[PDB]
């Protein structure tokens, strides 16, 4: 259905975003080498094209909606997504925004001013290169399209619940992206209102986030925070669902703590809205207010810790089978524990006053968001891809892609925790002379990681040629070897095509109209 083009546009935009990574880091190698435009002419335009194109165009559609519109109805048992007309709306809205964003890059000067476009004089003074209106419209359509898919996923896992599943033992990806869309509702239209406010300010000269008229930019600063903090929780929580499923099926289908897991995910969904706070702790709010803020970011750090202790208990005591998605899950877990550690580090009160807009926070958020989200999307593709695409994915090249990604991204984003505390500024085009050390090996690592992306492209072209002696069966047979089936059902569905080893039983590729008969749980 929508999923195949939905994934093709994600890969297109991902190679565009890695090209932006290539250009930005190739400039950041040595002082003033590759590009003469060390200014917001072309360079801050490149970092905004990079950031907003890649977060909005890659992790957001593939992680929520691709696995959503292909794998939420197939895991809950639904025929199609409950409003089949507006997935089609939202996804065809998306590449019009890709055209809108590349038009924002192309025009005369370029008002690209970072992905978090702060008002005070991003105003009509910058609109001789009026790009930033096109950038905020591309973000506005991506905003409403993710909203539309969020409503669709909520209503699909509400009314089209197949008579198997009650609300007490639900799958983790299903309940995961239900919490994700239920969390997306409560944060999207606030920033839609902020888009139309500041667009009215920079078009029809009423200027309430700007300087004149006593306009105050801190209202917008609260607004885009209040959107962008649950935005990154949208960025990670279906990733937690996918990591739960791969940690399940490659080691041990008895996983640790389901009801505890879904309670912890609802705890993250509760406590994740009301701390927009740490992102500009520094600005000079009140002391009791910022102390309450610092205290509550610790309590948003608790339940994710409970979840990763649960998966730590899960991989323990199970027959691990080190395929490529199990390597993705174990690398996910190791790097995300350290990223949440540095989260607690930045989460303190009196340390953002030394850590804001430096490369220490940059290494931290690249660490959690890049490692977590892209390792989860890696696990999702190399996990569900022979089911949907019907072809086996040449396991040895998947192994070398994993190792090459791991060492490349690690040697990129580990030196930033050294470059940051010494006092690098953020989005610096030309850094001082005493910072030339670690950016060189960061550039080496960026070429390593884009080589691994090109290796992924050769694997994606190798998805044509039906290897049989490379990868056939996840969760190899226990003690049987003469009987042949998918070897695991911890609840006894086994109805027609749905079971407890959920949706591995459709066919390869699944039919254009599956689910004729309603499934049942034991």
């Amino acid at each position: 259905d929508i999923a195949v083009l939905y994934f093709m546009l994600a890969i297109f935009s991902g190679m565009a975003g890695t090209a932006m990574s290539l250009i930005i880091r190739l400039e950041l190698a040595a002082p003033g080498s590759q590009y003469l435009h060390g200014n917001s002419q072309l360079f801050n335009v490149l970092v905004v094209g990079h950031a907003v194109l890649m977060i909005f165009f890659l992790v957001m559609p593939a992680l929520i909606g691709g696995f959503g519109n292909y794998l939420l109805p197939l895991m809950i048992g639904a025929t199609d997504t409950a409003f089949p007309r507006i997935n089609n709306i939202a996804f065809w809205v998306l590449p019009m925004g890709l055209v809108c964003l590349v038009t924002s890059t192309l025009v005369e000067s370029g008002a690209g001013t970072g992905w978090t476009v702060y008002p005070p004089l991003s105003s009509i003074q910058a609109h001789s290169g009026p790009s930033v209106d096109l950038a905020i419209f591309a973000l506005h359509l991506t905003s409403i399209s993710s909203l539309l898919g969020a409503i669709n996923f909520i209503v699909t896992t509400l009314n089209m619940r197949t008579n198997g599943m009650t609300m007490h033992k639900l799958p983790l990806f299903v309940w995961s992206i239900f919490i994700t869309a239920f969390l997306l509702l409560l944060s999207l239209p606030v920033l839609s209102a902020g888009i139309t406010m500041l667009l009215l300010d920079r078009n029809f000269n009423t200027s309430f986030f700007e300087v004149s008229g006593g306009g105050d930019p801190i209202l917008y600063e609260h607004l885009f925070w209040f959107f962008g903090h649950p935005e990154v929780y949208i960025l990670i929580i279906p990733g937690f669902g996918i990591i739960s499923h791969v940690v399940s099926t490659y080691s041990k289908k008895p996983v640790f703590g389901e009801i505890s897991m879904v309670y912890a995910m609802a705890s993250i969904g509760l406590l994740g809205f009301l701390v927009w706070s740490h992102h500009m702790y520094i600005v000079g709010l009140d002391a009791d207010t910022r102390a309450y803020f610092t205290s509550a970011t610790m309590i948003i750090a608790i339940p994710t810790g409970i979840k990763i202790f649960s998966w730590l208990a899960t991989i323990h005591g199970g027959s691990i089978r080190l395929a490529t998605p199990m390597l993705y899950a174990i690398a996910f877990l190791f790097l995300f524990t350290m990223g949440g550690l540095t989260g607690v580090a930045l989460a303190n009160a009196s340390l953002d006053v030394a850590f804001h807009d430096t490369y220490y926070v940059v290494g931290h958020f690249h660490y959690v968001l890049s490692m977590g989200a892209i390792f989860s999307l890696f696990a999702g593709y190399y996990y569900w891809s022979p089911q949907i695409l019907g072809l086996n994915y040449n396991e040895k090249l998947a192994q070398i892609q994993f190792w090459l990604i791991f060492i490349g991204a690690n040697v990129i984003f580990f030196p930033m925790h050294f470059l940051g505390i010494n006092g690098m500024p953020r989005r610096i085009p030309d850094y001082p002379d005493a910072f030339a050390g670690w950016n060189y090996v960061a550039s080496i690592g960026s070429f390593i990681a884009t080589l691994s992306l090109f290796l992924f492209i050769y694997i994606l072209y190798d998805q044509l040629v039906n290897g049989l002696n490379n990868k056939v069966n996840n969760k190899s047979v226990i003690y049987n070897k003469a009987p042949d089936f998918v070897e695991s059902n911890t609840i006894f569905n086994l109805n027609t095509v749905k079971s407890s080893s959920i949706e591995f039983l459709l066919t390869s590729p699944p039919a254009v109209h599956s689910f004729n008969t309603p499934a049942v749980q034991s």
Partner: peptide
């Protein structure tokens, strides 16, 4: 019916042709 869908298809066709004619003025002044 479709007797109004035909001129609507026409005005939609010009409404998605002419902004693509607008964008070289947007890049070239």
């Amino acid at each position: 019916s479709a007797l109004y869908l035909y001129p609507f298809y026409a005005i939609f066709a010009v409404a998605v042709v002419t902004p693509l004619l607008y964008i070289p003025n947007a890049i070239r002044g």
